[PDB]
Every structure is written in structure tokens, then in C-alpha cells.
Design a protein around this ligand. Structure first.
Ligand SMILES: [Hg+2]
Ligand SMILES: [Zn+2]
Length: 256
């Protein structure tokens, strides 16, 4: 199936997912000179004080920290959005080296990693219905650079041990996502898609200007994960990022 290797990588995704060549693909390079300041864009509203994390799972392409979205406990609203979006899960994309790992690029600059906070439009009732709508999902994208440790990320780091291989899961309660947020909420927004198959063009991307820094030892731990299932030949989970796609007919707006 699809993956990130030279034989099943992003360059091959179109064969099974023709929308890989669609008009609103993600990620893209954020050219800051061309992005347009939109004074009509409201401030982001992040309400995560009632967030209920449940578990973490190695899905074979990343590790997802899953949230209870049966009620409006952790929501995203405002910015360029109309309505309430509920947090379903958060995951990352990282590199084999500190010089790459992010999906989105700013002036072609790649970061060490990229965090994606996935939310679905509550007017569609379920995540699976939201995925059939142009305004179905809202993804908060946060860049990671190597520097000082991110205090807030250590519980995630520490549990990786336990979900080393694909299909493995561990209980993961009382994790507060607020500890992964940069100080500033300034952002860039554009209409896009999922970055992995099925690549559905249902996303409203919100990529924060300010990166969060993490230590070298923290990102090191992410690189110890495996794409493979237990008892299979070891393949380190590294470089699980999709390169920039053509902006085509779109406008990147800035909140600042
Ligand atoms: Hg869609
Ligand atoms: Zn992602």
C-alpha cells in the first residue's frame, strides 16, 4: 500500500488516488511576499481546556493522539472559519535529519517537524461526513524547530516506547494540547487537502507563523518509531512528509 519509500512514496500516490493531482492539494510553499494580509479575518479561538485525550496509536505512517469528540470539549472557531470544529486527533510529520520534516514550507524553508491538530465541522455530525465536504476539516499546522526542549511534549515523548510498531496503542489520558501552542496565534490560511491518501480536498489550513522549538533529544525519539508491524524487518519511521504541491488557482491569506 501507500507509504513514504522510493516504491510507494508520494510520487506514486496518484496511481491509486488520482486526486493527488487535483486543484487544491496540500502542502504548499508559503511565499510570504505574495500572501495577502486580510483585515477581514477574525482572531483564532482555540478552546482546549476541556480536552479529553484517550489514546495514542502507531498507525504505520505516524502516531496519532486521539481525543473524545462526542461533545464540544475541545474546539476551534473564528479565523477564517464558519462554525465550530472539534478536535479529533493530532499527529506529526518529521525528518531523518533536522533540515527537513515539515510538509508546509515558508519561503522554501523546511522545518524539523510539523504538528497537525485535526478538527471536523460539527455541522456534518461525524468525521466521515465532514470528509465529503469542501469546508469539512480545519487543520492547525504548527512548525517545530530544534532548540530548547518543549516541556509540554515530554509525556508524548515518553510513551513512544510502548507504541513502537504499527498497530500498537497505549492509553493516553489527561494530555493537555495547550502545551504545544506557540505564544502567538498569527497565521496564514488557504483551502487545501489531507496530506495523506485519500488526499480529500476538504481542508481549511491554518498554519501558524511562530514555530515551537523542541530539543534534539525529543525529535530523536520520534525517529526510533517503526513503520513496520511487530516481528517485521525494521524500517524507521522517518521522513513521513509529502513535498509541496502546486498552488494553482489559490490565494494564501495572512492574518497579520
Ligand atoms: Hg471534501
Ligand atoms: Zn498531517
Amino acid at each position: 500500500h501507500w507509504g513514504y519509500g522510493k516504491h510507494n512514496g508520494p510520487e506514486h500516490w496518484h496511481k491509486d488516488f488520482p486526486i493527488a493531482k487535483g486543484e487544491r492539494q496540500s502542502p504548499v510553499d508559503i511565499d510570504t511576499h505574495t500572501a495577502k494580509y486580510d483585515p477581514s479575518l477574525k482572531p483564532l479561538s482555540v478552546s482546549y481546556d476541556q480536552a479529553t485525550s484517550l489514546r495514542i496509536l502507531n498507525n504505520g505512517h505516524a502516531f496519532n493522539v486521539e481525543f473524545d469528540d462526542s461533545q464540544d470539549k475541545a474546539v476551534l472557531k473564528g479565523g477564517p472559519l464558519d462554525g465550530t470544529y472539534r478536535l479529533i486527533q493530532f499527529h506529526f510529520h518529521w525528518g531523518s535529519l533536522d533540515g527537513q520534516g515539515s510538509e508546509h514550507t515558508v519561503d522554501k524553508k523546511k522545518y524539523a517537524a510539523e504538528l497537525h491538530l485535526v478538527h471536523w465541522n460539527t455541522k456534518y455530525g461525524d468525521f466521515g461526513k465532514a470528509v465529503q465536504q469542501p469546508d469539512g476539516l480545519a487543520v492547525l499546522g504548527i512548525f517545530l524547530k530544534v532548540g530548547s526542549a518543549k516541556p509540554g511534549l515530554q509525556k508524548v515523548v515518553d510513551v513512544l516506547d510502548s507504541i513502537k510498531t504499527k498497530g500498537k496503542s497505549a492509553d493516553f489520558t489527561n494530555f493537555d494540547p495547550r502545551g504545544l501552542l506557540p505564544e502567538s496565534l498569527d497565521y496564514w490560511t488557504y483551502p487545501g487537502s489531507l496530506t495523506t491518501p485519500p488526499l480529500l480536498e476538504c481542508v481549511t489550513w491554518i498554519v501558524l507563523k511562530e514555530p515551537i522549538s523542541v530539543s534534539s533529544e525529543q525529535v530523536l525519539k520520534f525517529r526510533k518509531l517503526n513503520f513496520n508491524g511487530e516481528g517485521e524487518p525494521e524500517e524507521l519511521m522517518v521522513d513521513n512528509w509529502r513535498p509541496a504541491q502546486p498552488l494553482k488557482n489559490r490565494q494564501i491569506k495572512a492574518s497579520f
